[PDB]
Design a protein around this ligand. Structure first.
Ligand code: LSM
Ligand code: LSM
Ligand code: LSM
Ligand code: LSM
Ligand code: LSM
Ligand code: LSM
Ligand code: GSH
Ligand code: GSH
Ligand code: GSH
Lengths: 142, 142, 142
């Protein structure tokens, strides 16, 4: 509870953001009179819809690496990248909605932020496994 | 293990439900002869497909707030909302499949249940951070 | 940290794989000149796109049962099924991309692997709840 409080905070933040994306899609459906089960129509809608879906399919990847990084590398560092990513995603959604081209900048920022969490998670896990493994390897060649 | 057993139970339940949604979509594909990579056809299919996809994109949001709420607020309360939500989602899927209109009632029930988890998670995290922060704020104005 | 290190490893692996699926879809978009917010075009593209989406909607189910199984049943066993599943998913993506029929074999392997995690998670949770419940049931009929 004490060692994961920040990660949980970022996580909740992330959820709130996804919730926001949804409300926006619901509003797009209304504005452009696009009723389910339809997911296609004017590009101005399709973009808003696609921005929400794209963010939704990366969320688990975010939550996953956020927690692994926070637990095996550094909680504060993992949480900071969590924010930077979450912010980049907001900018992505908002940009994408205006123009498909305006999604790129924010998309890249997201990748960089997400790739850090992955690199950190990797470095964390590596630090946890490698030593013990190398010692077991040496002990073997006794 | 002892402090999260209920959350894990609800979680497993949630997975089983998603698994159920999938089998249903697979059955829809068969019934309406809609082979991949197609995701469009008769509305009777599209609804079933969309019900499964909509539940799938909220699942992470569910799992996320379920665990944060269960860990920072109250496990039993978080687990109860987990059920209420999971049930609302079943009703959503089943309703949506019949009619796009029959998805609304259950959809709202889902939102309410999900919003609770978020409110609880928020209250939990707030209780964990606020005090320490306020004391640090006061100590500063010494 | 020590009791979940393998699960976190498999998890990170899983993320890396999803990241791989994405890059592939981005490459498909380029190859077949399919720019967002479009998600339809030549079947050779649609399959690649659908393979990535299908893997993305099961990921949370994977992560969920992976951790519940690893925590309530056996970490090493849960991690092994994690690999077997993750491998089956790679084979699924790669097969699907070539042909919709080549996705079936790997898809089934995925189901089997995933169903194990669910069975294990169930057995784990059952072992944690059942006894205490039965004793409470007997104590009642005192
Ligand atoms: C944190 C939770 C995520 C946030 C949960 C977001 C989803 C639940 C919110 C429902 C808002 C009204 Se849906 C709206 O409701 C209209 C009223 O009839 C329908 O007519 C519309 O078809 C329909 O789009
Ligand atoms: C290789 C790639 C390097 C990437 C850096 C990733 C940092 C993650 C661990 Se920080 C820190 O990394 C420390 C190691 O420098 C860990 O020492 C423990 O493990 C030691 C085993 O040698 C024990 O002797 C020692 O008592 C015990 O404290 C800490 O647990 C851990 O918090
Ligand atoms: C908990 C795990 C989630 C539950 C996992 C659910 C997915 C795996 C179950 C596969 C069932 C047969 Se797919 C069926 O298989 C047919 C047989 O050829 C194909 O012809 C169909 O195209 C195809 O739809
Ligand atoms: C503000 C919004 C309020 C929303 C309520 C959310 C409840 C979450 C914590 Se319940 C309960 O909330 C209790 C506080 O009433 C916490 O007391 C601890 O922290 C205290 C620090 O004052 C310590 O003095 C004390 O020894 C220590 O036990 C409990 O940890 C915690 O289980
Ligand atoms: C672990 C993280 C997951 C991995 C993150 C993967 C997503 C971020 C990587 C962006 C690669 C270039 Se997108 C490419 O960028 C092109 C350049 O203009 C655009 O023109 C294309 O429309 C556009 O597809
Ligand atoms: C019914 C379906 C069976 C499915 C098997 C799933 C295995 C999960 C628990 Se393994 C193992 O399963 C052991 C029970 O055989 C558990 O014993 C504890 O709980 C005992 C309560 O009787 C305590 O007396 C004992 O001190 C205490 O250690 C272990 O915690 C646990 O690691
Ligand atoms: N589901 C995504 C996976 C690949 C991806 O993330 N692509 C980036 C760069 S091409 C994107 O912003 N795609 C727009 C979208 O997914 O709607 C897709 O189909 O494009
Ligand atoms: N992916 C959803 C996000 C918004 C949402 O959850 N909408 C609710 C109320 S309009 C719904 O049931 N949508 C039907 C669906 O997603 O198929 C969408 O595109 O509609
Ligand atoms: N979202 C999936 C859920 C059902 C599913 O997983 N189906 C399997 C066997 S029919 C599959 O490989 N579907 C191809 C796909 O989802 O693109 C769908 O719409 O088919």
């Amino acid at each position: 509870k004490d060692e994961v409080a920040l990660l949980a905070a970022v996580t909740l933040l992330g959820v709130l953001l996804q919730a926001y994306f949804s409300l926006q899609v619901i509003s797009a459906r209304r504005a452009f009179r696009v009723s389910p089960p339809l997911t296609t129509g004017p590009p101005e809608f399709e973009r808003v819809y696609r921005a929400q879906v794209n963010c939704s399919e990366y969320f688990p990847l975010f939550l996953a690496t956020l927690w692994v990084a926070g637990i095996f590398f550094h909680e504060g560092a993992a949480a900071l990248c969590g924010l930077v990513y979450l912010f980049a995603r907001l900018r992505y959604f908002q940009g994408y909605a205006r123009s498909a081209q305006l999604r790129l900048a924010p998309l890249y920022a997201s990748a960089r932020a997400l790739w850090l969490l992955v690199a950190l998670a990797a470095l964390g896990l590596l630090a946890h496994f490698l030593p013990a493994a190398l010692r077991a390897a040496l002990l073997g060649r006794l």
